[PDB]
Amino acid sequence: PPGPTPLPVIGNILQIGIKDISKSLTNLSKVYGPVFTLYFGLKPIVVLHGYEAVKEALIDLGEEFSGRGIFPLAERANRGFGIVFSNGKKWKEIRRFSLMTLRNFGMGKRSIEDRVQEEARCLVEELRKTKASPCDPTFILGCAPCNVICSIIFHKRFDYKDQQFLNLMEKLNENIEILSSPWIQVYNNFPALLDYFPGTHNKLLKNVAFMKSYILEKVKEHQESMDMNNPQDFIDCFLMKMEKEKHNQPSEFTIESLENTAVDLFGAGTETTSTTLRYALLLLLKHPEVTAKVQEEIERVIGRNRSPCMQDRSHMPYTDAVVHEVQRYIDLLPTSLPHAVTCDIKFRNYLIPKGTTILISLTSVLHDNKEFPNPEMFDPHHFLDEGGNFKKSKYFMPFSAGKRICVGEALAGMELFLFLTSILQNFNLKSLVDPKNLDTTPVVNGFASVPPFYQLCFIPV
Ligand code: HEC
Ligand SMILES: CC(=O)C[C@@H](c1ccccc1)c1c(O)c2ccccc2oc1=O
């Protein structure tokens, strides 16, 4: 498994960096091929680059590449396994369960779509409160996704002002700010620095503990008020799954793992959806041509009366294309989340030892040159055939693919569509600075992409 020969202790840091480490991977693939080795300090990593190599690993050899890889910082900042950081039987079981409860009608009488439709109405309520004045959408947009998860786990969304909510929001946001500081990377290359400067990770652990104890409060309220026969949320389902397991036992389902699975969902379900929404509005501000066509579809398919629903997406190929294009263009998780091989595998004549960390280049699939002609540009036609119909692609991998594919793929797509169509149905977007002037190019800091700062006005139609 070829790759640049590492220096004594610093590894390949001089070539990949700490900056846009995704750009370096693409450049490195031009010289070492689709399957190459990289060193983050002493740790050996295998990077998979093209669609062919990603498909082959994630799908063809799905089981073998279903392990979750964990870097030094993440390892020290995590106490307890839920779904995101889990491996083996613990992962397999908790994930299967979560996917089951996350079905549209997998948690009682009320559907996920319904909880998302209520939030969309509320999102609009809040944007109306801005009275069409210059606004930084970062906050409002972040509240909606967090609240959807709150609704799924507690059965009750919160008013955007409830203190419980703001505390939860604050911790989630604090953790992001920390994980998004460049220098975090120094820890991944030099794990010993964790012992010397523990401030970072002690803080993440603290924040997680705050959230766990807060969720514990909730599960305790749920253990009291629980009507087995009538589950209403993720907790109710978890609690009653524990009862199905009371007789088998040692068991993967515990209050501990419930707390861990709950925070994982808040963490994995908030930030990325939030950032995508913010990035979508920026792009819509930049391309009013595009926004006008999306509004044409809204006006014709959905009234201005009723609220959007998922049934409408099929009759809204342009909007669907715009949303797909937003995710494809922004490349939020350029290297997904680290994977690890489940066993000693032979891959494309290479030989990768059990436990080896695997980095999946989502960028390289999302920005494939043949599939998406001018990949670096925002163009909804990337998902439209000659007739204005939705043109799907197997290269559309923003949620990754295979056994570890985003558990919230359905939920996220539901939020993006309903929130965005709801916003554009009730408001027109006005930029203060003017379009031709603002830049939409992603800013990257470590292993996550984000948009630049901007403001806009939500003008009622
Ligand atoms: C349930 C709420 C939820 C929402 C909403 C959500 N995710 Fe996830 N996502 C998860 C969970 C849970 C995992 C962990 C999956 C695992 O480790 O098995 C995950 C994992 C991922 C991964 C890991 C891929 C890999 O190969 O392991 C990527 C990439 C990802 N999500 C992208 C996204 C994007 C992009 C969005 C939205 C724009 C999004 N997610 C929204 C829950 C969510
Ligand atoms: C936060 C970190 O120190 C590194 C981070 C990461 C993300 C993408 C590609 C490489 C490294 C990381 C995670 O976000 C992560 C998330 C869930 C489970 C395990 C993880 O391990 C990581 O290293």
Side-chain angles (χ1 to χ4, degrees), residues 68-71 73-74 84-85 179 184 188 335-338 359 447:
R68 172 60 74 217
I70 325 197
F71 278 83
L73 194 260
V84 183
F85 299 61
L179 293 165
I184 271 289
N188 290 327
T335 62
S336 192
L337 250 42
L359 287 192
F447 280 120

Side-chain angles (χ1 to χ4, degrees), residues 365-406:
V365 181
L366 252 34
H367 294 192
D368 186 276
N369 224 172
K370 182 155 192 255
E371 189 72 1
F372 308 109
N374 303 309
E376 301 309 299
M377 309 211 281
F378 182 80
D379 182 6
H381 292 338
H382 281 279
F383 292 93
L384 293 174
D385 55 23
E386 25 278 330
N389 304 139
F390 182 73
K391 182 176 66 213
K392 72 185 177 191
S393 170
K394 42 169 178 174
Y395 291 75
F396 185 66
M397 263 182 221
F399 297 100
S400 180
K403 305 279 163 112
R404 287 269 183 175
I405 192 171
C406 186

Side-chain angles (χ1 to χ4, degrees), residues 314-354:
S314 64
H315 303 14
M316 294 165 80
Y318 191 74
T319 306
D320 202 348
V322 173
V323 178
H324 276 258
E325 186 58 1
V326 163
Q327 295 193 272
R328 185 211 71 75
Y329 174 88
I330 67 185
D331 188 25
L332 243 60
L333 293 161
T335 62
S336 192
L337 250 42
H339 280 259
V341 291
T342 285
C343 66
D344 280 12
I345 202 65
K346 181 190 143 159
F347 181 72
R348 313 254 285 221
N349 300 149
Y350 285 124
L351 189 21
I352 307 172
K354 163 179 181 195

Side-chain angles (χ1 to χ4, degrees), residues 70-111:
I70 325 197
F71 278 83
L73 194 260
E75 162 169 296
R76 286 284 296 273
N78 213 59
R79 221 83 110 328
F81 295 109
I83 181 172
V84 183
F85 299 61
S86 285
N87 275 297
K89 312 135 244 60
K90 183 168 213 64
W91 171 62
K92 285 192 183 307
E93 275 176 72
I94 294 182
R95 180 186 167 99
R96 175 159 209 160
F97 169 78
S98 305
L99 272 175
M100 214 85 85
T101 74
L102 287 178
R103 289 171 301 173
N104 195 208
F105 299 94
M107 285 182 295
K109 309 193 182 199
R110 189 136 127 97
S111 71

